[PDB]
Amino acid sequence: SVFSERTEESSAVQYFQFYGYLSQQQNMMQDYVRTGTYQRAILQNHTDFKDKIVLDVGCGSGILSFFAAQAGARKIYAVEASTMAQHAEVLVKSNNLTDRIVVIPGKVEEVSLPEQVDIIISEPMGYMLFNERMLESYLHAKKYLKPSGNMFPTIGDVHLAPFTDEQLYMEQFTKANFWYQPSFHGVDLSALRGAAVDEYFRQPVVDTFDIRILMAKSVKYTVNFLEAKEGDLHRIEIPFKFHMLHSGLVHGLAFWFDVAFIGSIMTVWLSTAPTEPLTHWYQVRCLFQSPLFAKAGDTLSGTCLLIANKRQSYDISIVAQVDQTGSKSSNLLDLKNPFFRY
Amino acid sequence: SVFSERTEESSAVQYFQFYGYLSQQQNMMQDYVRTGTYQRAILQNHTDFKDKIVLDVGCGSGILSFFAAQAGARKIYAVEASTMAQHAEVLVKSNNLTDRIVVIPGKVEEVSLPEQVDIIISEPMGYMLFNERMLESYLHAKKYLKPSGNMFPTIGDVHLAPFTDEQLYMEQFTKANFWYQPSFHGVDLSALRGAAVDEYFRQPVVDTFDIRILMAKSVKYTVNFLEAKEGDLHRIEIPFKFHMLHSGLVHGLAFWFDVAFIGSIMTVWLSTAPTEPLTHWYQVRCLFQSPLFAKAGDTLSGTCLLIANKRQSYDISIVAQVDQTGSKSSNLLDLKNPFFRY
Numbered sequence: 001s002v003f004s005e006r007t008e009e010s011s012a013v014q015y016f017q018f019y020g021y022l023s024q025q026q027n028m029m030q031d032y033v034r035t036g037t038y039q040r041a042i043l044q045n046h047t048d049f050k051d052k053i054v055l056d057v058g059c060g061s062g063i064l065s066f067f068a069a070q071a072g073a074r075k076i077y078a079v080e081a082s083t084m085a086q087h088a089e090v091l092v093k094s095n096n097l098t099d100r101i102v103v104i105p106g107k108v109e110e111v112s113l114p115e116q117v118d119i120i121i122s123e124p125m126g127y128m129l130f131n132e133r134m135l136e137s138y139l140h141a142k143k144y145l146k147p148s149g150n151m152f153p154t155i156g157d158v159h160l161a162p163f164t165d166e167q168l169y170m171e172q173f174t175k176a177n178f179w180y181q182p183s184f185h186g187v188d189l190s191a192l193r194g195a196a197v198d199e200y201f202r203q204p205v206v207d208t209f210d211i212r213i214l215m216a217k218s219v220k221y222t223v224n225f226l227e228a229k230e231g232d233l234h235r236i237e238i239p240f241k242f243h244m245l246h247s248g249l250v251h252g253l254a255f256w257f258d259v260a261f262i263g264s265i266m267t268v269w270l271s272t273a274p275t276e277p278l279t280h281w282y283q284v285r286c287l288f289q290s291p292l293f294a295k296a297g298d299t300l301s302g303t304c305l306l307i308a309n310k311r312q313s314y315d316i317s318i319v320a321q322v323d324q325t326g327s328k329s330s331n332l333l334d335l336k337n338p339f340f341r342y
Numbered sequence: 343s344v345f346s347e348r349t350e351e352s353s354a355v356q357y358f359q360f361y362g363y364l365s366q367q368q369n370m371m372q373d374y375v376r377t378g379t380y381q382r383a384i385l386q387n388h389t390d391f392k393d394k395i396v397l398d399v400g401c402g403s404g405i406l407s408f409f410a411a412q413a414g415a416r417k418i419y420a421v422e423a424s425t426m427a428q429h430a431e432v433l434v435k436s437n438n439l440t441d442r443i444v445v446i447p448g449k450v451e452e453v454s455l456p457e458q459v460d461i462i463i464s465e466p467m468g469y470m471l472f473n474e475r476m477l478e479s480y481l482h483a484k485k486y487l488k489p490s491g492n493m494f495p496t497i498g499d500v501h502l503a504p505f506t507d508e509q510l511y512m513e514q515f516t517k518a519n520f521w522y523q524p525s526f527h528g529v530d531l532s533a534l535r536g537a538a539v540d541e542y543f544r545q546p547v548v549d550t551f552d553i554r555i556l557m558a559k560s561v562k563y564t565v566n567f568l569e570a571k572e573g574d575l576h577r578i579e580i581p582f583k584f585h586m587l588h589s590g591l592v593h594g595l596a597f598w599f600d601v602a603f604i605g606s607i608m609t610v611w612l613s614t615a616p617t618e619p620l621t622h623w624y625q626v627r628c629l630f631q632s633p634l635f636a637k638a639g640d641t642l643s644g645t646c647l648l649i650a651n652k653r654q655s656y657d658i659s660i661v662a663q664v665d666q667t668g669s670k671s672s673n674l675l676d677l678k679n680p681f682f683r684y
């Protein structure tokens with residue numbers, strides 16, 4: 001299938017094993033912004049579910065299918081590839097909804113559905129939106145979507161902005177400088193310093209931060225899920241031109257995302273911005289190995305390039321430049337191995 | 343080879359991926375009990391290394407080979423299966439030891455050595471000693487050992503003791519009681535509470551504790567690495583009869599280990615006991631499903647049976663009983679998926 005065609009088997013095993021655990025499900029359900037926002041988007045747009053056929057892609061514990069049933073769906077097919085599917089079936093029986101919610105075990109790329117659906121619901125967003133590469137499964141599920149069917153979420157906005165954070169930079173730099181040691185128990189480690197710094201600087205930093213560290217207004221990059229094809233997510237190129245509002249050192253770029261549920265009654269937004277209550281997606285910063293100095297009024301321009309890999313993640317290229325001085329920075333980051341600083 | 347026949351390939355991929363990172367190596371090197379004890383055991387037994395042939399099994403960064411070089415080894419073969427081997431080679435060159443230390447990439451079960459060795463060194467201990475199943479690679483490397491050759495470490499002692507920890511025991515039900523809710527956003531979750539409880543009790547708990555919670559002297563189970571076969575580790579049966587030193591409720595068993603480097607000059611001990619400074623092995627606790635009351639002077643008897651699996655770990659089966667009252671408890675735990683509580 002398309003899933004095994006883009007996924008190393010060891011990565012898939014670890015991934016689905018991880019999501020089979022009830023403790024993980026408990027952790028995600030306790031993100032109240034996330035669960036309450038999903039419920040609000042589905043229930044306040046009840047007309048998009050009343051007597052309709054719905055597909056829930058990666059239903060996990062099944063919570064979104066319960067929301068869809070509460071809003072009046074006639075039938076919901078809930079597709080889930082991990083052993084969580086078994087737990088989801090247990091809940092469907094204990095809540096007396098077997099006439100409404102049909103759990104289908106398997107990958108959405110591999111299963112067979114009996115009919116086309118009026119609406120697709122899912123929670124396919126990983127860190128930085130794109131990590132885990134579940135957006136591609138979500139878009140693949142459009143083969144089951146009737147013409148003029150809807151998607152929940154409907155669109156995704158990624159935000160990027162340059163930041164300054166000397167304490168974060170020094171934390172990572174001093175960790176790497178352990179390898180500057182010429183006599184660690186009598187041994188010279190310093191030939192590996194460059195390797196160690198590379199290793200540490202490829203790790204995107206998952207945590208939250210004050211918005212005072214941002215040095216420019218965010219640039220926005222939009223994926224419309226009603227219109228994107230899976231192959232659009234293999235290579236994601238985000239050009240950027242920042243107009244610097246503060247002078248100082250740019251230590252890297254900060255990423256967050258909002259998704260929008262564009263319903264017939266209202267549009268509901270779920271935001272992981274640092275100006276909004278905290279979610280289990282936090283925010284993500286990519287550090288430059290060498291920061292760039294900039295003056296207020298300067299322009300920081302460049303490209304953020306995401307290349308999908310077979311470990312369900314992305315290789316990140318950030319190339320950036322201060323136009324007024326020609327100072328340049330090039331960075332390669334490994335989204336699969338984040339540093340959870342929370 | 344022997345390694346691929348006892349190991350699912352998906353597990354081996356994750357294992358070697360994990361040890362490929364410089365940050366893990368750094369974390370291990372910063373454990374001063376571990377590094378300083380290995381150095382001291384090798385250097386203080388210099389006549390066991392002077393002009394000798396040494397094999398280093400799972401050399402990682404190379405640090406123990408450098409210790410063997412400090413002590414005067416004529417030739418050191420350093421075998422390493424992860425990408426860490428490439429960093430090890432860089433260190434061998436930058437420390438001017440290319441004529442004495444030969445890095446061999448690959449699994450010790452698969453590579454070829456050019457000659458027999460006088461002494462084997464390694465750090466094959468995982469949590470509870472046996473986790474990761476690296477001791478079997480250690481023992482397998484005795485195919486390369488000369489008659490009357492030595493092993494460093496030479497012996498391993500696993501210790502078991504019963505403990506009381508009412509807060510730890512209760513934490514499991516408090517976590518699982520998140521599911522005991524009839525209307526989580528409209529959904530009755532209660533039918534999964536039992537499953538959640540079962541899930542939390544299969545997890546051994548990796549952390550430290552005050553020694554006041556131990557209710558008896560430890561029972562010791564010894565593996566003599568000079569005389570053990572690989573097959574001795576496939577099924578590890580540890581009988582116990584504890585003589586209770588304190589009265590109270592027994593919540594489970596606590597595990598730690600010591601190893602001994604028995605050299606010609608002296609024996610050096612590396613201990614992970616809770617009475618000793620803390621190491622990155624911490625300690626391990628396995629809960630009983632039901633606590634057992636015991637009075638001081640009673641005997642708590644039973645068996646801890648460790649069964650090797652293909653995930654490089656062990657299924658742990660614990661049966662215990664208070665002899666004077668007939669009260670019985672068991673548990674079954676999966677050592678590959680511990681809960682890091684520290």
Ligand SMILES: Nc1ncnc2c1ncn2[C@@H]1O[C@H](CN(CCCNc2ccccn2)CC[C@H](N)C(=O)O)[C@@H](O)[C@H]1O
Pocket residue numbers: 003015016019025028057058059060061062063064079080081082084106107108109122123124125126127134137280281
């Ligand atoms: N090809 C596929 N076919 C079928 N099923 C798939 C496929 N791929 C993945 N799955 C499942 O989709 C579930 C993913 N979860 C979302 C995880 C969100 N990730 C985050 C969140 C915050 C921070 C970081 N990461 C769904 C949530 C669900 N609505 C619920 O409420 O539980 C997991 O069960 C996965 O196994």
Ligand SMILES: Nc1ncnc2c1ncn2[C@@H]1O[C@H](CN(CCCNc2ccccn2)CC[C@H](N)C(=O)O)[C@@H](O)[C@H]1O
Pocket residue numbers: 345357358361367370399400401402403404405406421422423424426448449450451464465466467468469476479622623
């Ligand atoms: N069949 C095999 N063939 C070849 N190589 C193998 C095989 N199997 C494993 N390896 C390597 O052995 C290394 C293991 N490390 C020890 C790490 C375990 N320590 C802990 C501590 C706490 C909790 C868990 N674990 C050696 C450290 C070395 N002395 C140094 O100085 O770094 C890793 O590089 C492994 O890839």
